[PDB]
């Protein structure tokens, strides 16, 4: 019963939801889940992702339809319309160094209060961050990022919802799957249990609540 | 040609068996000029060790790209991984060399290369992590922004990190930031020392043995 | 038989599809008593979701054990992982239920279960993470230590965690720590309420609902 | 080359070395590498591991031969000789919660100044730790653990040194592989490049320095 129709997105993605969405410039993004969110104009989203992809693709489609109040991302240069909405003041943009975002999301998923990283030290990224020195090197305290729903993409799921990824479509998806309260995984193929080995699986079915097509 | 002079010069800095990351844009041309006798491994921060050239037509895979979403190949022995693993490689000091583009380098070796206030806001991406974490950072950069010096006393553009880059390479000079300033180690063929000093606002220490190359 | 009364009663607390970790010892007997219309998934902290019963003779695999290095099987759909991932499941609130043994629980719901000064020095292992992180902690425990109450006002033995355990289960009672202290919800058919209170040093709120089962 | 004779251990592991050694109660431990260390009485070792296994096995053999000055571990209860040496003062023992230890080692390996965790709060392990509050929850600041040499076990390596693991022999190995200055991986089989898929490999060859049998 993890597999559901895409229609069920509207019961799961609330208005104003804070969402984690996988994908590197639209590689390893749940485009179908995205399209449904647009079909039903679920808006005022706080979207946590690596980027806003392109105006024509993935998360960038959410931005073109102005369904985002805020994006927490590391990169927006490929999407000129994310740039315009940031500037016109309709879209808060919290820039996060890609590796800090990976570990902040991870910290939420694995139950850490935060991580200390040297990245960003001495840059605008130090603003309003606790600074901690450990044996004389300074680090920014970086804090866990939570979300209501993780909208991830994967190559295959077995009947129990175990997931494997493909090449550079992995990026942020397995990490988001552990951090959000509810995890919806868009996948390309459903395969029998025993097709994905214990040594190959990267996301266990137990943490995947819903699956689509 | 001025970008080709830079790519060729950076390529000679690469040693056998290194894990190397190339920023999008100018640094990626470095891949075109590796010595045939030198074999290195490329990391793309979207999640691959063992990146290779773009595929012939028909050999594209939608799930295999570089950090610009452009199609690549993977070579035998490649590994792909999530973005936390990717930046554990980078931030944890297992990336031997990163070659990045530059807007300014200053005389402390500080690089600014991710934002111009008011003109472009693409975000940092992984630049802050790469510069903070790579064993060796090499900046590959046209010498002047339409005449304006890019090697300056103190960066006026926002810093990518306070780590001291290990090498600057322009079409005109090779400069190694050191404990006591910027050290000009090589001068271009097709340029003169007088020309480099004029086009460098920053203070340069000059090396006893100054060479010709890029 | 007192251990079976406990394991049978704990087994009833588990619901279909939960991820469950059983501490070594008394809690491992819980697996013998799952209702057979209830299907669960077992996590072992050494790095497996999907643990199964010990293998028939000859079907042992040297790389596949429980958290006490005893040979297990893996069921269809199991995942194996490193120790950092293992404790992201446990500390990240993805383990629905852990059933651990006990030395003392006090009325703040605090469990002490990993060391006795002057005797047992085994280390904590994953016990501190399990107690701190499991969605639901169930303590499975003889009611007394050779007659001494184990449910006490305040733990005198070293705490495993300051997390409030969600359920104590003994051969005599089912007790639920709450904001207002320890709440006695059930008592064994083979005992009486006077006996339970006499063997609990801690203050017990007796429920209006008071049930008889285990 | 990466592959060397097991004899070369006495060249690579020094007296007084700080070593991370993989394995859970001897499952996924480099039993050959340990045997070498015993053969040549390389001693005064600081060993970082999940446990000291049993007197007859894995790390427990290092303790039986009194080759460790210190162990940093989460469990020592299965090995009475580690307990005996601790009491007698010959063996310093630093107990660490198993999940804290995974993340402390990981932090060294991925370049973090430290991590904050709720485990240990209000127990003896809060002693001599900085405490940090984040949204009203207390955490311990826990700190990177580095080592001179990681002694890990894996199932297979390809010609380039990529590693895969097997089932619950994985435990601490892939993590220690990123934390130590030099990495020696005992493997059971060496296989051609292309035998281990990019989607399957868990430790890339680039971080593995030497390999034995
Ligand atoms: Cl090809
Ligand atoms: Cl069997
Ligand atoms: Mg969930």
Numbering used by the authors:
A (entry chain A), D (entry chain D): 1 to 213
B (entry chain B), C (entry chain C): 2 to 215
Show sentences the authors wrote.
CtfAB then transfers the CoA from acetoacetyl-CoA to acetate to reform an acetyl-CoA and produce acetoacetate. CtfAB is a member of family 1 CoA transferases. CtfB contains the acetyl-CoA binding site and the PS01724 signature sequence which includes the catalytic glutamate residue (E46) sandwiched between two short antiparallel beta strands on the N-terminal end of an eight-stranded mixed beta sheet. CtfA contains the acetate binding site and the PS01723 signature sequence.
Additional support for the necessity of a carboxylate is that mutation of the catalytic glutamate to serine results in a catalytically inactive enzyme that cannot catalyze either the CoA transferase or hydrolase reaction. The E46S mutant is catalytically inactive. The E46S mutant hydroxyl group is not within hydrogen bond distance of any protein atoms. Instead, a second acetate molecule binds in the space normally occupied by the catalytic glutamate carboxylate, 3.2 Å from the E46S hydroxyl. Acetate molecules were identified in every CtfAB structure in the substrate-binding pocket directly adjacent to catalytic residue E46.
